[PDB]
Tab-separated table of C-alpha atoms and ligand atoms in Angstrom:
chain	number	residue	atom	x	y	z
T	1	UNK	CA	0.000	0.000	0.000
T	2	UNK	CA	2.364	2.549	1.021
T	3	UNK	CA	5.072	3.594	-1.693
T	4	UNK	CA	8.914	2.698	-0.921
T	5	UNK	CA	10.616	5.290	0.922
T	6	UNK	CA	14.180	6.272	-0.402
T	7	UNK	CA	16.564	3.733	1.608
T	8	UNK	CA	18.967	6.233	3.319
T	9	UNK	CA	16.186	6.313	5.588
T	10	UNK	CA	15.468	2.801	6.928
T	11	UNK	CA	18.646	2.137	9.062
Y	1	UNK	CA	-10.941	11.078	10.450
Y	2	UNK	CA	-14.946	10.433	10.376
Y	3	UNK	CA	-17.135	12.828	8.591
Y	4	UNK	CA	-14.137	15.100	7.442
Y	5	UNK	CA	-13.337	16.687	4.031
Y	6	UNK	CA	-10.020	16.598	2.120
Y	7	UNK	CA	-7.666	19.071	3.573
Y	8	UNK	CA	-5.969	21.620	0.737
Y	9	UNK	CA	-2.103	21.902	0.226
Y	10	UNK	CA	-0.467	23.322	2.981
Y	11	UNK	CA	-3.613	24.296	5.063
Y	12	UNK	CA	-1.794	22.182	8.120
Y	13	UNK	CA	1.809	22.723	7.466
Y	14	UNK	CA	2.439	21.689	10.940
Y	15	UNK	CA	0.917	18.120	10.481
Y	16	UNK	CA	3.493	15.504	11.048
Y	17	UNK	CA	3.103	11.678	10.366
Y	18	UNK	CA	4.792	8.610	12.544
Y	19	UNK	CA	5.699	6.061	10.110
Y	20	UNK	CA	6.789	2.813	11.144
Y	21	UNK	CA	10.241	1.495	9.594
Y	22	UNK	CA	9.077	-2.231	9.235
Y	23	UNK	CA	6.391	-3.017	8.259
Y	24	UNK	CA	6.241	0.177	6.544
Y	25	UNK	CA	2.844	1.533	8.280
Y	26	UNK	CA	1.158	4.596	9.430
Y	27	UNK	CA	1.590	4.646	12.966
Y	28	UNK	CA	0.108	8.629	14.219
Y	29	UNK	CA	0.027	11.578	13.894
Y	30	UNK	CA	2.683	14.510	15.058
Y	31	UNK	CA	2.859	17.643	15.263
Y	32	UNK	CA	5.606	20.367	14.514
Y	33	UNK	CA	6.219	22.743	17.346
Y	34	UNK	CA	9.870	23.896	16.478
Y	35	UNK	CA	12.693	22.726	13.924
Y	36	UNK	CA	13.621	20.100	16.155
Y	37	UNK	CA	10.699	19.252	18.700
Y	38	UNK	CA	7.695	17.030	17.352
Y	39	UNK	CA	4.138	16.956	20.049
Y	40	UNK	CA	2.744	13.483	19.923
Y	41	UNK	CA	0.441	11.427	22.287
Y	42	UNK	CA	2.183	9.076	24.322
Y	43	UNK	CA	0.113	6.385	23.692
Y	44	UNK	CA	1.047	6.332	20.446
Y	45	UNK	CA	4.410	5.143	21.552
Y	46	UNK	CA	4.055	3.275	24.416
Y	47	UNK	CA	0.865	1.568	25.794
Y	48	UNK	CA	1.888	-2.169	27.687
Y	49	UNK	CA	-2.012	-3.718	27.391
Y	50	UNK	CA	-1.304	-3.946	23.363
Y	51	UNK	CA	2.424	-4.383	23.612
Y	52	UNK	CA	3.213	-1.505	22.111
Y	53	UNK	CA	6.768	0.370	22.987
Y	54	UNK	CA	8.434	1.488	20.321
Y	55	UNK	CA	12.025	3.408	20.549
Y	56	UNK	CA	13.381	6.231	18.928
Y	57	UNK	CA	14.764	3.143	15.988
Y	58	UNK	CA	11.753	1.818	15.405
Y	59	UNK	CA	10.151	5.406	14.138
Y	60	UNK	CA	10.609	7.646	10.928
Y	61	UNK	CA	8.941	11.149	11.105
Y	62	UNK	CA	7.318	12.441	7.693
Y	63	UNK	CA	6.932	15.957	7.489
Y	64	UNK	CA	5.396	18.264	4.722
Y	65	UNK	CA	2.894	15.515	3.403
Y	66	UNK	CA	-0.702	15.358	1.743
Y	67	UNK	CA	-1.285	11.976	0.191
Y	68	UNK	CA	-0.943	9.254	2.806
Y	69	UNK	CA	1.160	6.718	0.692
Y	70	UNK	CA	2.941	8.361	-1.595
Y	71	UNK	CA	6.293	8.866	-1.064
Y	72	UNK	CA	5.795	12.865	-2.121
Y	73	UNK	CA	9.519	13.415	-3.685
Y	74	UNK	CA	10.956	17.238	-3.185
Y	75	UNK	CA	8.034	18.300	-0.807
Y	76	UNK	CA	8.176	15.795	1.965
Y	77	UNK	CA	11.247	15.708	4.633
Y	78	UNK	CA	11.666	12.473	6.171
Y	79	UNK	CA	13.455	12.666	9.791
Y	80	UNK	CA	14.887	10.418	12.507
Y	81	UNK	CA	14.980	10.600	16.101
Y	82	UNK	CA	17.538	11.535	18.342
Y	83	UNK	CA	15.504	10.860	21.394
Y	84	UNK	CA	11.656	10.636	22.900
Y	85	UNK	CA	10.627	11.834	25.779
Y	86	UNK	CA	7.111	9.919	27.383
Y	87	UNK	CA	5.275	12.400	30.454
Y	88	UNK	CA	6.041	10.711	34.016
Y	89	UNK	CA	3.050	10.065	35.170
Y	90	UNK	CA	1.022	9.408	31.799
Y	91	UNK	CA	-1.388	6.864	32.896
Y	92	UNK	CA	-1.740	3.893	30.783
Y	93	UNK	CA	-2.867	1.881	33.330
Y	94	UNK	CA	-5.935	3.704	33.757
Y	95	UNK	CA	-7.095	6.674	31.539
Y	96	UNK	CA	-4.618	7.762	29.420
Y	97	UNK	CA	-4.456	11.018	31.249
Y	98	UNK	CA	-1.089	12.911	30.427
Y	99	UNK	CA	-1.522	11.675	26.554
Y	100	UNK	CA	1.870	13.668	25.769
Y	101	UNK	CA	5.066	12.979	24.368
Y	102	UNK	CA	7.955	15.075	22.790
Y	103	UNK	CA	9.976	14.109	19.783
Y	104	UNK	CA	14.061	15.714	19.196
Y	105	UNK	CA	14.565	14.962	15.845
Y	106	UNK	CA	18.190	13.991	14.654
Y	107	UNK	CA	18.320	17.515	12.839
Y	108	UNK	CA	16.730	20.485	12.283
Y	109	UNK	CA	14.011	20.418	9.337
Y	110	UNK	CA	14.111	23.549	7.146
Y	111	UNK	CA	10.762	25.116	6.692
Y	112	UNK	CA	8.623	25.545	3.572
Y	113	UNK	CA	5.556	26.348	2.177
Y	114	UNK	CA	4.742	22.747	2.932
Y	115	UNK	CA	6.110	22.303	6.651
Y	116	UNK	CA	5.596	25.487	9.415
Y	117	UNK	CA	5.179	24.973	13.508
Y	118	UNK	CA	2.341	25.489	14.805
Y	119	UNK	CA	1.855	27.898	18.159
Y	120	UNK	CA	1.870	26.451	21.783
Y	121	UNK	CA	-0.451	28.359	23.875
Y	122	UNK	CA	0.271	30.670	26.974
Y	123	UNK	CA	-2.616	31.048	29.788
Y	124	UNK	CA	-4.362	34.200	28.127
Y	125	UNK	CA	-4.803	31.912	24.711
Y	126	UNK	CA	-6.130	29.206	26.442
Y	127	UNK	CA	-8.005	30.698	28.731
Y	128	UNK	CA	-9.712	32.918	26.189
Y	129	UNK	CA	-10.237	30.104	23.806
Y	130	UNK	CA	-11.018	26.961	25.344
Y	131	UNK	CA	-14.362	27.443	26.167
Y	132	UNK	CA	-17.590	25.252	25.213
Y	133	UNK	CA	-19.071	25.878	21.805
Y	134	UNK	CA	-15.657	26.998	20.026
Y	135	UNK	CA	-14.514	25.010	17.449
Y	136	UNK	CA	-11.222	23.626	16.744
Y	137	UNK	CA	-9.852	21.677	13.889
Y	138	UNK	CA	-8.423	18.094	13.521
Y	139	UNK	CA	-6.830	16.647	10.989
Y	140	UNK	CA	-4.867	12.840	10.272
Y	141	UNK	CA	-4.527	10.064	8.098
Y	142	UNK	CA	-6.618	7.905	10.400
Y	143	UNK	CA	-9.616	5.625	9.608
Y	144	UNK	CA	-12.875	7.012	7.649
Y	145	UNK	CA	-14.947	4.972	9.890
Y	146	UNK	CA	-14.960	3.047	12.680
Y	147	UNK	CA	-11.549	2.708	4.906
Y	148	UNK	CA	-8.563	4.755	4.904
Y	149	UNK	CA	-7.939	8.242	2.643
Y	150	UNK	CA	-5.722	9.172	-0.184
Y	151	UNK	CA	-4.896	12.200	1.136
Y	152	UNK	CA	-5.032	13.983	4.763
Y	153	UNK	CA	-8.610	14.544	6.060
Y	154	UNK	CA	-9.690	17.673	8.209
Y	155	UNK	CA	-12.340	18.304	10.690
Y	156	UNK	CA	-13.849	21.061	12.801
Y	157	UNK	CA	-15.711	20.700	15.892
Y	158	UNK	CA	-16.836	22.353	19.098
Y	159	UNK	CA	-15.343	21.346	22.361
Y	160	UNK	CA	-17.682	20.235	24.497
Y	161	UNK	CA	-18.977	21.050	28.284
Y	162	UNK	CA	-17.273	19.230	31.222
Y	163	UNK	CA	-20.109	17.632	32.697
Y	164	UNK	CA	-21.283	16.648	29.523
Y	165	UNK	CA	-17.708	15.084	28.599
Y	166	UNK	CA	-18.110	13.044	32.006
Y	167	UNK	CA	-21.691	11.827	31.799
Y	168	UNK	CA	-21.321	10.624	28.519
Y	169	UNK	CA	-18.213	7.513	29.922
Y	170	UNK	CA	-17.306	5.605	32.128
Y	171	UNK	CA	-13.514	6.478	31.973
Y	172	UNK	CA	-12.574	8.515	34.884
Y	173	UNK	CA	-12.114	11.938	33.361
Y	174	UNK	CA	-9.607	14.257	34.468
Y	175	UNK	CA	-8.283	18.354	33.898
Y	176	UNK	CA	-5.560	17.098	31.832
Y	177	UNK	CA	-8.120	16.949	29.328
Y	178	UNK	CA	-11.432	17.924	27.177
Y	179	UNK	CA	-13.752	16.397	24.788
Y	180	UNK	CA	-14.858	17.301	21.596
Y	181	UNK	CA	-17.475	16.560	18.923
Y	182	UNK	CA	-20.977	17.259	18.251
Y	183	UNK	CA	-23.835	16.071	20.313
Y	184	UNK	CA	-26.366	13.712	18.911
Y	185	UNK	CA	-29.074	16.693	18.718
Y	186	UNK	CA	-26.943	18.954	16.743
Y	187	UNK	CA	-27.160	17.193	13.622
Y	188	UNK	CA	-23.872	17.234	12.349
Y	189	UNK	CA	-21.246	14.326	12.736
Y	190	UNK	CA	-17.387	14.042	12.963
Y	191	UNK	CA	-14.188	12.218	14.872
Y	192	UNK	CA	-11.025	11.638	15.232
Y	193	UNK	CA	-10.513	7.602	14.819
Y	194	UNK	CA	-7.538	4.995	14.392
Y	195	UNK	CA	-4.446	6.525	13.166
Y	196	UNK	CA	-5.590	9.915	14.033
Y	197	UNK	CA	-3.998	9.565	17.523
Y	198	UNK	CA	-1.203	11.818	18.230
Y	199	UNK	CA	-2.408	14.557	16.090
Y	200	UNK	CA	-2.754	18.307	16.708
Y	201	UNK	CA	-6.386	19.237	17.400
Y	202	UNK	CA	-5.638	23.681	16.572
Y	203	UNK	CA	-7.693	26.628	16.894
Y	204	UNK	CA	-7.042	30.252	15.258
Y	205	UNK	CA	-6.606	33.160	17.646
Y	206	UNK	CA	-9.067	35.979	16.457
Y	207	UNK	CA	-6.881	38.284	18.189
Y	208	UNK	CA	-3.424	37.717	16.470
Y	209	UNK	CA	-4.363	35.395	13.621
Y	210	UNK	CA	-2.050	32.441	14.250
Y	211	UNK	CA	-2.724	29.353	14.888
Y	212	UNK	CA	-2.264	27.445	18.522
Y	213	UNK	CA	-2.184	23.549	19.240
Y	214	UNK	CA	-4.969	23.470	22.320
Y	215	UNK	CA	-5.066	19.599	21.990
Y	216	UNK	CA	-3.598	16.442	21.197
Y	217	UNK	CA	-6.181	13.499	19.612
Y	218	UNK	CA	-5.882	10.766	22.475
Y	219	UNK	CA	-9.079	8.892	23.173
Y	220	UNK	CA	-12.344	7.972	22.203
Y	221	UNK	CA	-14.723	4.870	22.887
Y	222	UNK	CA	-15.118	3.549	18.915
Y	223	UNK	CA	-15.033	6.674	16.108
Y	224	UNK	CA	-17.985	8.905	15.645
Y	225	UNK	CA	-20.743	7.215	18.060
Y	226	UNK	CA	-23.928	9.372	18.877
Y	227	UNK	CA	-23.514	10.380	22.974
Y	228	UNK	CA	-19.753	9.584	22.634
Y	229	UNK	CA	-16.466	12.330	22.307
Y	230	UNK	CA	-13.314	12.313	21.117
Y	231	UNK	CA	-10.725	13.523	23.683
Y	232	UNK	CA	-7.869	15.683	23.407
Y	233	UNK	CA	-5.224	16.000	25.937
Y	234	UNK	CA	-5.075	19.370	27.635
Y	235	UNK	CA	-1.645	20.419	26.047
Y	236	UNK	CA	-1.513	23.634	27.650
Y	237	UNK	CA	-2.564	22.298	31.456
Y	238	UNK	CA	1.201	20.037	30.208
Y	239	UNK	CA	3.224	23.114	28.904
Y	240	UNK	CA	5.409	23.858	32.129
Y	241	UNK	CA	6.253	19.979	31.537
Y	242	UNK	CA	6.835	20.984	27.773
Y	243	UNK	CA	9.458	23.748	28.691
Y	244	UNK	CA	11.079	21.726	31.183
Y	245	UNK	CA	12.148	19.074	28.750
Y	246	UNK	CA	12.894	21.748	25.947
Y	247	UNK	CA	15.355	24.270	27.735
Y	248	UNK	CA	16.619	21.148	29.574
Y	249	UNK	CA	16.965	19.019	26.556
A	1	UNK	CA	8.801	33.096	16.208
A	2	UNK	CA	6.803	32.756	12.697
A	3	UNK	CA	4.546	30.100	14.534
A	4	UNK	CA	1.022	29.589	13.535
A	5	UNK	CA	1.235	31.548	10.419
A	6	UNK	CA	0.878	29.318	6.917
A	7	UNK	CA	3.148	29.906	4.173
A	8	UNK	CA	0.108	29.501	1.193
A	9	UNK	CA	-2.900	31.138	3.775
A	10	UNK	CA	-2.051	33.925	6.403
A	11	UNK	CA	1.532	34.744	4.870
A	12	UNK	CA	-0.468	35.195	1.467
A	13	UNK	CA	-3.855	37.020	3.633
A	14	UNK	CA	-5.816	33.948	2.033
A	15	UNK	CA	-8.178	31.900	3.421
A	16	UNK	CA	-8.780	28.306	3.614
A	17	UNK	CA	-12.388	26.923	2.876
A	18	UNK	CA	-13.722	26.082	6.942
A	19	UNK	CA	-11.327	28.481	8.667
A	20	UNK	CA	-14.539	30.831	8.563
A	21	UNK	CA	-16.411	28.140	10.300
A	22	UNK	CA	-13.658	28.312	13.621
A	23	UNK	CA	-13.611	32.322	13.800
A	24	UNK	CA	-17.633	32.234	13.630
A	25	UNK	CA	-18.106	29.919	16.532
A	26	UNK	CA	-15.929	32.574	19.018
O	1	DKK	N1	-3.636	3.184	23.222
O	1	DKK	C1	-4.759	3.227	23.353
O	1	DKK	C2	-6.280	3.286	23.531
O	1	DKK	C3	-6.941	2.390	24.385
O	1	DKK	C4	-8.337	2.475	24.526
O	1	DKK	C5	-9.081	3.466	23.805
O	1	DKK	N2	-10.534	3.533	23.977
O	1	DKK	C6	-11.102	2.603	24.941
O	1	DKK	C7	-11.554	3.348	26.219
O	1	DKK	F1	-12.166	4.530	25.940
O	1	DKK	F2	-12.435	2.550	26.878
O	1	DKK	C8	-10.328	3.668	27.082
O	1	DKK	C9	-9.893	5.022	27.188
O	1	DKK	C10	-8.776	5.342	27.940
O	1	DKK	C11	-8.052	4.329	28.574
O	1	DKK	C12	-8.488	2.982	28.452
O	1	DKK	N3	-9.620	2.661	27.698
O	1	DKK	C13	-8.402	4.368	22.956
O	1	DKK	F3	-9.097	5.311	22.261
O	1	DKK	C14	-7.009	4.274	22.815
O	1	DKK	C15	-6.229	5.229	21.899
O	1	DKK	C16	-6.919	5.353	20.524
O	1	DKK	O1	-7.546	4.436	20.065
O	1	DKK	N4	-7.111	6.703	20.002
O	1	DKK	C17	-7.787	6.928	18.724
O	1	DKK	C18	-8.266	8.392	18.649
O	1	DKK	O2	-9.411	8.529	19.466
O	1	DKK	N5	-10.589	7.919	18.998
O	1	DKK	C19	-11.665	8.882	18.870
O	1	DKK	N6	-11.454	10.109	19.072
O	1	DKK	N7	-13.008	8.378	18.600
């Protein structure tokens, strides 16, 4: 449902 | 949000959403207060009877956003947390009373047309504006009913008497907060719901046109139910609490 | 500081569509 984020920010 | 309406772009610049790094999931609404400081409810970070206790890694913080799932590329900042800070004596055992938590994000968000803090109010605001009959305005990514929106949702109602707030539960109510809504004679509908929680609940001074956070969304017994309210913790009654952990912090 | 004040409403002296709603009920 939700769109991927940019992945810098799931750390 | 029951009953609400699309909000337009920018009308709550200081609207801030939790987002949960996995799953990826809507976990609250936020608030904006400075460049650094997010207002949530505590419950929407801790509350033991669902197992819920997240910690400053678990949490992204979305700010500047409309749609709910989009990922809304050169308008939306997306921020971690350095550290959050849960009231003492919130009471999850019991009522929820002290909903309140702050946020220090990892670094200062720059401001746009698209992300703006809101106003925390002194005594004279409050005072003058918290009153019964006065509306406010809500707003979140929450639940339609007691299903979910495309883009943030907005609401205004009336707070709502004291005694009336109290007759109308069973929770033990408490000054740390008020209820709003619309009673079941007044013919028009509208809550707060899942997902809301957390979320700024602002009025507009008439005296200086800016607007003030009065409330935080916190609890309500299902979404939208005739002789029920949604309530709001009492952010000001919580401000010298607020300071304390800013200047000290 | 600038708190309270929206970039695309009270920055601009425009309205958005309910605001009216809020000021009436004071
Ligand atoms: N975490 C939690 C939690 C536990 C019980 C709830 N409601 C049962 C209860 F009212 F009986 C209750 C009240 C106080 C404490 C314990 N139980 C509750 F609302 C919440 C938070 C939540 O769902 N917020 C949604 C936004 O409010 N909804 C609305 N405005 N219509």
């Amino acid at each position: 449902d939700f769109e991927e984020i940019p992945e810098e920010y799931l750390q | 949000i029951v009953e609400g309406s699309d909000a337009e772009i920018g009308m709550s610049p200081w609207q801030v959403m939790l987002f949960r790094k996995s799953p990826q999931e809507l976990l609250c609404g936020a608030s904006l207060i400075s460049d650094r400081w997010v207002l949530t409810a505590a419950h929407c970070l801790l509350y033991p009877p669902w197992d819920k206790n997240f910690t400053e890694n678990d949490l992204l913080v979305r700010i500047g956003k409309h749609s709910r799932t989009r990922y809304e590329r050169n308008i939306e900042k997306i921020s971690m947390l350095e550290k959050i800070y849960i009231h003492p004596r919130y009471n999850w055992r019991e009522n929820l009373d002290r909903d309140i938590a702050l946020m220090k994000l990892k670094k200062p968000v720059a401001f746009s047309d698209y992300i703006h803090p809101v106003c925390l109010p002194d005594r004279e605001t409050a005072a003058s504006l918290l009153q019964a009959g006065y509306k406010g305005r809500v707003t979140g990514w929450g639940n339609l009913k007691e299903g979910q929106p495309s883009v943030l949702q907005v609401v205004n109602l009336p707070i709502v008497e004291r005694p009336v707030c109290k007759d109308s539960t069973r929770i033990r109510i408490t000054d740390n907060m008020f209820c709003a809504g619309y009673k079941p004679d007044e013919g028009k509908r509208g809550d707060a719901c899942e997902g809301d929680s957390g979320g700024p609940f602002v009025m507009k001074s008439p005296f200086n046109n800016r607007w003030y956070q009065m409330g935080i969304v916190s609890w309500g017994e299902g979404c939208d139910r005739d002789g029920k309210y949604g309530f709001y913790t009492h952010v000001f009654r919580l401000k010298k609490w607020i300071q304390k952990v800013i200047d000290q912090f | 500081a600038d708190c309270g004040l929206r970039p695309l409403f009270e920055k601009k002296s425009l309205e958005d569509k309910t605001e009216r709603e809020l000021l009436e009920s004071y």
